[PDB]
Every structure is written in C-alpha cells, then in structure tokens.
Amino acid sequence: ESTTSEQSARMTAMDNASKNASEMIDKLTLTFNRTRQAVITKELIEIISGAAAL
Amino acid sequence: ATGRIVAVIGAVVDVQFDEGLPPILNALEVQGRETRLVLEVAQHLGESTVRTIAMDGTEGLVRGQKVLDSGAPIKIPVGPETLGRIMNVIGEPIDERGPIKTKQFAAIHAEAPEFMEMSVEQEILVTGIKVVDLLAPYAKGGKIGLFGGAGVGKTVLIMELINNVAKAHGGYSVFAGVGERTREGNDLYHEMIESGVINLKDATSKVALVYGQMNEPPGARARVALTGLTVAEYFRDQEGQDVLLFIDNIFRFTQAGSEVSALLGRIPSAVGYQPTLATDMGTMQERITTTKKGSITSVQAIYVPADDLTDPAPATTFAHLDATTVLSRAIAELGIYPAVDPLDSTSRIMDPNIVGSEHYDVARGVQKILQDYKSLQDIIAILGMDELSEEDKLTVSRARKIQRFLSQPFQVAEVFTGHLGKLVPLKETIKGFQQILAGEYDHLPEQAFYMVGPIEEAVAKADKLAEE
Amino acid sequence: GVRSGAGAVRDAGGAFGKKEQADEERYFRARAREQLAALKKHHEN
Amino acid sequence: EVSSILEERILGADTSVDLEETGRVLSIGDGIARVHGLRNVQAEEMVEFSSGLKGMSLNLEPDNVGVVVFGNDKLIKEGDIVKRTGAIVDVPVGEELLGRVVDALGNAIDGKGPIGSKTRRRVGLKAPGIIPRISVREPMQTGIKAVDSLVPIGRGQRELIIGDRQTGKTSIAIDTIINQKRFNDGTDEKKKLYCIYVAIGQKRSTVAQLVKRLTDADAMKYTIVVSATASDAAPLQYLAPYSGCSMGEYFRDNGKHALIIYDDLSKQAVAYRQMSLLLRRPPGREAYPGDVFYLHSRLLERAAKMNDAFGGGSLTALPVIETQAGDVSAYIPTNVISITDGQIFLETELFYKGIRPAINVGLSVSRVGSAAQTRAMKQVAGTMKLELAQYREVAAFAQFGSDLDAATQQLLSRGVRLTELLKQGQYAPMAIEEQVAVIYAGVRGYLDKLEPSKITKFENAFLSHVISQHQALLGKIRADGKISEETDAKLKEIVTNFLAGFE
Amino acid sequence: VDLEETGRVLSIGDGIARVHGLRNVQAEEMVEFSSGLKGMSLNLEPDNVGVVVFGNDKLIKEGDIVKRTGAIVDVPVGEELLGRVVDALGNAIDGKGPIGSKTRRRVGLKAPGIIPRISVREPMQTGIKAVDSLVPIGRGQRELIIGDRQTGKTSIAIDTIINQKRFNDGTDEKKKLYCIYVAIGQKRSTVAQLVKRLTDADAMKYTIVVSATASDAAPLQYLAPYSGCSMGEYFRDNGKHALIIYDDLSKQAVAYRQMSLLLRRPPGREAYPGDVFYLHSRLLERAAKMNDAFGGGSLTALPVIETQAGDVSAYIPTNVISITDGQIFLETELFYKGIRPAINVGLSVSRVGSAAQTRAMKQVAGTMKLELAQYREVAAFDLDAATQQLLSRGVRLTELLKQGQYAPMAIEEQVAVIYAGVRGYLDKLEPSKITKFENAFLSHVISQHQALLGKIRADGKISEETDAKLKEIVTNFLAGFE
C-alpha cells in the first residue's frame, strides 16, 4: 500500500513541478525577449550616436 | 620635411606639412620635447595635413610646434644585442643599462609572409601540463591561444609555460608585454634575472623583452605587439633559429585600436570596436607564423572581457590560432588550477594520424565522460545523488576523479598553493588518464587526485591519507 | 528559437546549482571516507 | 636557357602607351581613398593607382569618388594619380584554374606559373531567372552518412553549414570535396563535380594545410582554392565569394557541375561592414550596412540548376556561418538562413558527446527534401528519419529508461544504434552504396541484439566484408540506383550471415 | 591685443569655453579666465581652444580675456596637507587657513617603470578580519573594493583609514601609512560626516581628504583622483608609505564622460569616451612599491566601483577589475544575511596573496581558508563527523569573520581570535554567542595577556611556546565563559 501511494504521489508532485517550471519558463521567455530587443536597440542607438557625433 | 602641429585633440595629433607629405605609417619626431615623442602617421586628412597617433603623452604640445619625419616607420634596435634588454614601443631601452648597440634596425610594420612561404609540418610540443598535453596539445612552430577572463590564470599559465619551455628551448625567446601591469613586468624581469635566462654580467641571455604597459597612451599599446613580433621576425628570418614569442596580453592591442578609433574619425563598429578590427588583427597575426626560413612558436594570452567569448575581440582570434586553451572561471572557483576548460580547448594536432590512436582515444574518452557528467549534473540537481542508479554513480565518480586529476601544481604557482611544482611527461599523463577511465582507481578517494603529478603520486597521496 | 543545452543548471549558479554541488560533495565525502577506511584496512594487511 | 627565355619574355612584352582617365587622391586613410576627378567612372569599376595597387570605385559622390584599395594603404599618398581601367572587376575563368590556388582577383599564389585562362568573366553578373532553372533532382553525395541520409543536398541547392567555431564545418566541406573523387576520375560525365573552395579571413597556414590535405587525397586536380586571407585587404575578402561564384558559373553555363564552398561568409560580411563604415555609409543593426542582406542574396541566388535548354549544368553553394554561442537569431545568421534552402547544424555539445560529426539532425533541415536522393538511399532514409524522430521524442527518459515501457525501451535502443551508425571518422567519405548498405543493416533491426558500443567496430568490419567479397551487389546497387526486392533479399542474406559470424 | 599668450572666449556653454587665440597654449595647460575662474585646455583645435572650466560658468561670458599660466595643471603637494580637507585643485575648504605647501606636482605625471619597482613585501593592515585573513592587501598593491550601493565599500575604506592610527602614532618609521581619501561625486554632507568620523577616531592627523563633490564642476571631479594620486606620490618618492582611496571611480568616469561629450568628442560604449580604460589605467598604475634605490616608499591604492544590481560584467567595472591586482566583492545578499562586512570570500582574490602577510596570520589563515572553502562546498541545501562537523566549523568561522563598524582590530588580536576559531574552541558554543565570546575574549586578552600579544607582534609568528600559552588561555576563558 505504501509503495502504491508513494508512486502515485511522486507522479502527482512531478506533474505539479513540471507545470510550475513551464509557467516560469514562459515568464522568463517573455522577459528574455524584452531584454534581447532592449539590447539590440541600445547597441544600435550607441552606433547611431557615435556616427552622428562624428 | 618639417610640419606643424595644428590639432592636439586627445592622443591624436594633426600635423600639417607644406613641402613633403609623409606616407601613412611613418614615425614623426616632435621637436622641442625633453624626451623623445614619436607620432605615427595614420591618415591623410587632405590639404597637406596628416592625422597621427602619439606614442607617448601629448601634454605640453602646442599648436605650431615643429615636427620632423623619419622617412620610414618606427625602427627598433634589433639583433642578438637586444637579448636581456627591455625596450620601449619605439625601441628605446628602459632597463637603464645603456643604449642597445646593434648593427640592425627593422621597421615594426612589414608585409605578412606569402602563401608559398608557409610551412605545413607540425610536430607536438610537450609542455608537461596534463590538460594541455592531453586534450589540446601544442605544436612546435604553431600559434597558441590562452583565452581567459580576469583572474582565471592566464598570466600564471604563461609564466609556467615560459619556465617549462623557454629554458628547454634551444633557440631564442621574446616576451612582449602588451598593455599589462608594470608590477607583473618587474616580477618577470627579476624572475628571469635570477633564473639565468637574462644575465646582466655577460651576453648569454636568451629572452628579449618589449614592454608597453597600461600606463602608456593607447597609441603605444597598439604597437608594442608589433615591436615584439618584429624582434621575433628578425630572430626567425635573419637567423635560422627557432623563436618563442610570448604575448600578454594581446587583447590590449585591439583595445588600444578601439580607444584611438573614435578620435581617428571612424564610425564605431559593433560593441564599440573599430571597424578595422579584423583587418588590423589579421595583419598583426599573419606576421606571427612559421615560415620555411624559421619557426616562431607563439603563446599569446588573450583577455576575454566579462568572460564572454562571443565578444568580437576574442572571437576573431580563434581563427588565428592552431591550439586554443580556454580558462574558465567556473573551474577556477572549484579550485582546479589550471582552469583550462576540457570541453572548450581545441588543438589542430589533436588527431589519431598525428598524436597516435591511444592519445586520441584517451582524450576523446575524457571529454565524453565529462560531457556525460555535465548531462547528469542536471538530473542530480532535482533527483538527488543518492537516488541515482549504480551505473551512473560510477560515471560521476570517474568524472570527478578526472576533473581533479586534470589539476596540476605549477612551479611559478608555488608561492600561492605551496605544493611542489610538477612536470608530468606525456606518456605518464596518457597512462594515468587511461587507468582512471578503466576504473583501476575507483577504490581511491577523489581527494587523492587533486593537485598531483603522475598517477603514482596520486596513489601515494591516497595511501598517505589512509595512514592518518 | 531559443533553446538550451546539457549541464545548464550549474551554469546559472542559482539555488539548484548550489543544491546539486552540495549534494554531490556531501555524498562523495562519505564515499571518500568509506574508501579511506577500506584502504587503511587493506594496508594493515 | 633562363637568360634566353627571360629575354624572349621581355621582347614579347610590348610597352604600349595610350590616353586614360585619371584623378588625384584627395585623402587616403584606412584603405579608403577619396579621389578628385575621374568624371567618367562607372560604379563598381576597377581603377589602378600610380603605385600599382588596384581599386574599386564604389561611392561616386559629386565632389570625389570613393575607391577601396586592394592592398596596404601606405603606398597611396595624397595627390597620387588614379588611372581608369575602364571595366568592371572580372576574374580569369576556365578549366585552367583547376589545381591552382588563386587570390580574389585570380592571380596565382601557388607559384606554379601564370594561369592559362582564355576567358574573362565578371563578378557581379545577375543570377538566372525563374524560367532557366529547373527543380533539383540529382544528388550531391557529400560522403557523410548523416548528410546523405537525413539532410540530403542536390545539385543546384544552397545548403548552409552553420554552427559555432571548432565544430567541423570546414571538415564537412573538405570531405565533401574529397568524396567527389570517385566521380571525377571515373567515366560518367554527368556525375563529375568540380569543387571550388573559397577561404575568407583565414590564416595562410590553415589554407596551406587544407591544400596539402587535398593534394594528399588527389582532390586538387578538380578543385579551385580562391584565397582571401586575413592579411589581405577587406575588399579582397569581399570580392572572393563573387570571384569563386563566377568561377563556378563558368562550369554551370557549360553543362558541367560545380560545387562552391564559401568558407566563413560571416568574415566576408565583416569585411563588407568595414568597407561600408569607412566609406561613411549609414550603419544598421550590429553596424552592418542596410545592403548586407543584398550582399549575400545576390551571391547565393547565383547557385542554380539550369534546365536542359541552357546546358543542364549546376552550381551547388555551401556557405559557412560561424554563429556565436549558437545564436542563430543574429543578423548575418538570420540573413543566410533565410536566403539558403536548408542548413546543416553542428553543436559543440554533440561534438564532445561522441557524436562526430556534430550534425544535429533535429535542427538540420533540407527544403529540397528526399527529391535529392537515390531511390535506395531515399528508401532507407525515410525509415531512418522516422525512427530517429521517434527516438528524439523519447530521448529525455534515457536516464531512467530501465523502468520504462517496452515500446519506449525499444525506441531508445533503436535510436542509440542509429546514432552510433551516424558517427563517422574524418577524411573518410563513404560511397552511396556503402552508406545505403549500412543504413539498411541498421533500420531493419539487425543491430538490436548487438552491444551499442560495438556498432562502430561492426560497421567497419561489415563495410570491409561487403567491399571485399560482395562487390557485385554494391556495384549493382550503384548502377541501378535502387534497392530492388532481389537486392533486398541478397542484402538480408548477407547481413544475417555477417551478424551470425560477427561473434 | 595679443593672441599668443592670451585670448577671448568665443562661446561658453555647459562649462566648456571655446577660446580664440592662445596660440602658445599647451595641451592640458591650466588657463585663467577674467573672472578668476581657472581652466584646462583639452582640445587644441586649429582655430579654437576647448577649455574646461574649474567651477561655475555663469561668471564666464563671450569676449572675456583668457590668459595662460605657462604650466601644466599641478596641485600643491607636501606633508603640510596632512589633517586638511582640500578640493581637486588643492585649495583648502575646511576654513583652517591656507596650505603651507612649498612644492607643486603635476597631476598627470607618468607612472614608475619596471626598474624602480620592487616586489610587494610589507603588509597593509586594514583592521578587518576578512581582509587581513583571506584577502590580504600588501603595501603598494591596488585592491578594488567593488560592490553595489549601500554594501559597505566606504565603511571598509574608513576602517582601513582608522586602523593605521596604531602605526602612525608609534615609533618605527617603516610602518607609518599616510592615508589619503578622495571623494568623487559624493554630497558634502557625506564628506562632512566622514571627516567627523575621522576626527572622532583621531585619524585626521595623518590623512588628506580631497573632495570633489557633486556640486563641483565635472572637470574638478575628473581631476580629483589625480590630485590625490600626486599627493600620495610625494610620500612614495620620499621613503614614506601612503594609502589612497578613490571613492568612487565610477563617478569620475561619469564626469569624464560629461567633459568629453561636451567637448564634442564622439561617444563610445555606453556613451563613455574611448579612453575610459586609459583614464583609470594611467591613474592606478601610479600605485607602486619603490625599491631601496628610490627611497623604498609605496602608494597603496583602494579604488571603489559602484555596480548596478551586481552587474560585475559592466564596462567600467570590467576595466577597473582588469587594471587592479585584486577585488573585494561586496554582495548585498551577504549583507542582509547578517554577514557584515559582506566580503564574498569565494570570489574575493588578492594577486599578491601570501607574499605580503605576517607569518602567524598566514599560518592560521591557511587552515581557515581551507575550512571555509570546504564549508562553502557543503554550505547550501548527513555525516556528523564529516559533513555536520565541517558545516558547524564553517558556521563558526563565518560568525568569526563578522566584525562591527568603525572598530578595526590589531593584527595580533586577529591572529589570536582566528587561532581560537580554527583549533576547535568555539564548536561547543552556540553560533549566536560567538560574537559575544569574541568581544569578551578580546577584552580579556587586551587586558591581562598584553604580554602575549606583544610577543606575537614582535616575533611575527606564533611559535610552540606561544601556541601552548594561547591554547592554555583560550581553554581557561572557554571554561570560564560557558
């Protein structure tokens, strides 16, 4: 009985952990996209300012 | 030809000539200076005005001050008389031992060797370091890279390489400190004086020194590498002997170029580097090659900003080096010195047709088991080590043993760790790592393989720990 | 598309990387102790 | 003799003089010369300086003409005279370039005498239109089991070799060049493939090593090595891909089949960025100019498979892109991925995991698909691709595969054996029949009982056995091009016998 | 009117004054305006001179006469500046009267070469257990106190300042360290509080506070580190040892960026000039240890870098890290976890290392460092003998490293405390009571066993007799306390 209960609870806990990890993954993916766009914009602005100040 | 200074903006000095316009890459002497100030012609701005980069401080310069032209690029005193003598970017001796009386003078700017002059042969240079001689072996007459961040151990590694190779090298050696600390330069000078490599009393020195440090203006740090490689070029071509060229750090050449680029009048490239980054880096690097006349073994230390190897300055250098040694901060933080990354270091001679089947098999097995350990670390993070199977626990233990056995004390690092420096022969490294892969030492603790030389020392340390 | 690789847990250096390092060190300290005891018993022979 | 032939050469040379169009250098710096005058200069036209250096007039500004220098800028002084050649840049072309190492302009740098080229072809000719081309059908055997199986390449297809540094891109290109030996020295004309390797931004020692490797393999006799090393000026590195593309277009137009390998197109992009920035052209993302997608697009589109009306020739392009930390979202990687048909993706993790070559079959794609395969290779490769996809679906459970479903364990075993089959040594290309035989022995479940570590030894021994004793079956497969039912039964018997006798 | 030794302002804006004339002005030469404001000629353009104004520009207007001074910008230097709070130009601002300095020194003098320097030998005692034990700082070394805002960088600097008092009022001339503090960008209230702290600890009598506050013009904030560097160089070249603190170089970089951008010089990475690395490199390279041929002096440098959200991989922090010999990483996470000073000993390094460190401290610090490394290996989350004992020992050592503010410790007392911690005399006590035990043990040893501390200080190492006596006293005090 204990091993059956333990396996069932292990499956449920791993499923919950996977769901939480996926939620964190999508949130961090949105953050990563924002950061990537910000980095590209910042570097291009630096290049443009350097060219214009010449 | 005499010209007048019209602009002294920063380290960039604009000189206007009237009769004879000097060609680009010409050394200009500034009259009226208490010391010797040299300006290198970088651009022709037109209207008989040239834009120049100063090789020393620009303080005290006044518009209208007279400037001469040498008629040739920066010429350094070169020959066998420069051994044991430290010299500046422009060739002036800075060791207070008098002038470098030599019969030859060579311009630091020269054409790269042609395609027909390239030498395709490549031996293996055993260095005594386990990681280097095992996974990324060095080749005689080949370009060597020491990629690493700030504090990973590039300087200590290159000092150990100098200790192991330069003394055993029959030919001459050249060290070109580019944009580094003057304290390190003084330490190296005194160490080589007390090691007999540089002898002040008589002319038996084997190492020349070229030093432009971080206190120098960016113009100076962008040319010391050229001066050192020019001395190496003389030792390679005019004399048929083999040459050792140690550069630390080569990144400062690119950094100095970037520092002068903005004032030179260039639109900045990516991450603020000069648009001519790859061009100038290649022009410098192609000169440091093994020709048919002679062979130059170059061991260049490359600073990686923010430990980001995707930065353009270290990224472009990868194509210029045969064997590369990447020192990683993560490995150093674990205490494993040298911090060479086993899964990132590469060597062109790493091939069964060159290093033999056994060496290649051992190296590939080590790399494969370390990669599998990296894969299993993620599982251990969540599952737990005690919950792993019995099969992969053995793999993890072997990987830990291999990681610790890659570490090795250095003679130059005795002051820090306190361990006696070791120099393991190639066959001993191959046998030890093959035995570890075979599991012959699965009964020894992983602590026994940390900071040891040959595998016999590992078993000795194991039994000594068992005695206590 | 953004992807990942092997051994990225310790690279992030977060809670899980430190947890994995500590777990490995604690396990292998016990294993080293056992191996040292066995080696001492063998050396007594 | 030497003096006599020297005097014969000098008397043969005629010192003619004529009018020209000339201009003065207003300002020279960083390899960019601002030239006053030169009113009647075409855009992208070769011009030569007084010092002997050549140049390309790119910016035709009103006051001055901006010209890039094909060499060191120290030899160009303010006021020097820039003559006008009167022609757009062109390179020598023909069969005479085979076996020779030439620079971006076609000048011989191998020291084997002048090129006996009889024809001169430009570097900026337009690619063939929609009508002249035809659908790619003929295979381009690279000699790698992974490529010829899962990522096939046809003649006339732009296939990308993308990956980080030190992953095997140059090795893949060089073994593709080596593999074509079996077709060139043979008799079938429509199978010969002339390779053209363009080296961009690479040290001369590396190019010399590559040339020695090709010469030892007897592959130089049908290969052209266009070299624009890192020492060479940025304009030469910019022009080298176009010069190689024209050299391949010559073979393409004459009905022959050419293979062009632009090594490190990223370095060509860097050189073009340097030229554009020094010309004060407006920059863009990562300081690259706006017309940087144009640069690679008008180059790779010249790779095409002409129809029978135009000769039936072809030009296969294999660009190489050096990504940084596997970031394919960067500017040049995105451009080249969009331009080309597919890509062969290499990963450092797979390289050090024992999977050499490091081809990541999950990310590597081929839009031409199975249409560029032989019938036997297609037949085995469909099954292998499906099984490997199924394995990669369930590859996460390999760590805890012992306590898994029987189907999952079967898939894991089959995928591990197929992956062990995909491994291949360096500079050892395999014939198409040998590859199809190995893949047949794998997919048909003749390796499930065998130990996964013993696949490589079994593969080598089986290849030796089939080459030695069963050469007739391999020849029949090669000639027919398909694994027929009779050949299927013969292969079944052979693999069963060898598997029984392997232990 | 003369146009060679004087000129007029073409245009004045945002502290930059374009000058027509000054045909004989030199690069970086200090010029003088009509209103009394002084300047510095940075841009010698073909038809104008770009002068940065050392002060408020409201008093400078078009047509004002600009006159040369004939000398590159220099700062009053000497030992008279001890106990004085000066500005970037050396003028006294504490209302104590004029400075009696008889000599002047350029602010942009070249750093010493390879020959004049010698190895770093003498230790630079800071009074901090963590620094003096695990990240030792030598005399002539340059250590970067890097971290985020409100982590304790200025606290470490001022504690180092105070600790030198015991040496400065002592007898021997070879241990005196004449401190110098440079305040760049800080508000005047903070500088006043700092000098009040120094006066309270009587550390002002041997220190020089060069302040270029936020209200001061950008050129003053850019010139302040070089002024203090020259003041330290005076001691360095005269056989005396000096300590210089740049707090903080990030604000100096910001000021230099403002100056360069206002001078129409093209921006670079993060709008900073191309030579931001040079700006600090030519400054920190002037921190050297002269040999006996040059008097044997030294100039220890303690630059301070402010990192945004712990982004140690930023432009200026990476430049300064590459320049310096060692880094003292201060982390806010360790700060809030009760570890104060928040010195991350895992990443904190010292290139000189054991080369400049007293023998007893090195002997005990090797064991402490090994134990703390093992603890960090097994810190985060069950052998009682192997892991739990190691974990407890690491916790005891971590609580030992914690130290109060403005209370530097004598080196021998630190050695005694670390010896007590290392040799298993605190594993029995609760981790909470470790600080109380340390305070009580400090009091007892400094009261009764001053002879033992004197023996340790004079010998420089703990010998067998000293070790036995220290074991005896620590056992007795452990028995009495618990």
Ligand SMILES: Nc1ncnc2c1ncn2[C@@H]1O[C@H](COP(=O)(O)OP(=O)(O)OP(=O)(O)O)[C@@H](O)[C@H]1O
């Ligand atoms: N199939 C293979 N098996 C084993 N080793 C291989 C294989 N392919 C390549 N290598 C090795 O991998 C290394 C890198 O190969 P290669 O030079 O082709 O890579 P690359 O990514 O194109 O290089 P680079 O980025 O330096 O231009 C070489 O040492 C080569 O011998």
Ligand SMILES: Nc1ncnc2c1ncn2[C@@H]1O[C@H](COP(=O)(O)OP(=O)(O)OP(=O)(O)O)[C@@H](O)[C@H]1O
């Ligand atoms: N060793 C210490 N023990 C206790 N508190 C400390 C310690 N060091 C610093 N603090 C606390 O930190 C605060 C001031 O820190 P400090 O000024 O040294 O940091 P900082 O990083 O230099 O700051 P800022 O960026 O504001 O200049 C005060 O609240 C003080 O109590």
Ligand SMILES: Nc1ncnc2c1ncn2[C@@H]1O[C@H](COP(=O)(O)OP(=O)(O)O)[C@@H](O)[C@H]1O
């Ligand atoms: N055997 C070793 N090899 C390399 N570094 C070591 C070794 N032992 C200790 N170290 C530590 O590594 C650091 C490397 O310093 P350094 O070579 O200056 O790094 P970098 O040159 O990258 O700035 C030293 O501070 C030293 O304490």
Ligand SMILES: [Mg+2]
């Ligand atoms: Mg270094």
Ligand SMILES: [Mg+2]
């Ligand atoms: Mg390659």
Ligand SMILES: [Mg+2]
């Ligand atoms: Mg502060």
